[PDB]
Amino acid sequence: NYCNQMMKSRNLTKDRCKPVNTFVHESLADVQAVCSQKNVACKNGQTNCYQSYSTMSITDCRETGSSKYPNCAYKTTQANKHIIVACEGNPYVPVHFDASV
Amino acid sequence: KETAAAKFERQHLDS
């Protein structure tokens, strides 16, 4: 499935099994534009987070209960949700995924 | 080697 492939392909599960990860199916510039959208606070309290005005296409990758290195196993859940990212640097671009509503 | 903006992209972006 998509998650098993993309997670290994992107060097996420080549040396370990990551329990969960999210992929955004939007253009790079459209996702970077989120850094100047709705400011909100991050889970950790810091307020350099921003929520997208609109929902975006995303795939949630989740490890099953039987997954175990070196044979990671994921469940694929596709959805459209608002993404929350933390930004920093100059240009002000995303550096962390904080959640999706 | 890899900056944090690059890592976010490789880990979460699939355009």
CATH of the domain at A47: 3.10.130.10
Sequence-distant (≥ 6) Cβ neighbours of residue A6 within 8 angstroms: A12, A23, A59, A61, B14
The one-letter amino acid code at A93 reads V
Resolution in A: 2.2
Distance of alpha carbon A58 from its chain centroid, rounded?
A: 8
| Angstrom distance (rounded) from CA A73 to CA A76 | 10
- What is the domain range of residue A70? 1-101
Residue B6's closest chain A neighbor by CA? A95
User: Solving technique for this entry?
Assistant: X-ray
Q: Domain count for chain A, please give it.
A: 1
Tell me which residue of A44, A54, A48 sits closest to A35, measured CA to CA.
A48
Catalytic one among A96, A97, A98, A100? A96
B5 near A CB under 8 A: yes
B1 near A CB under 8 A: no
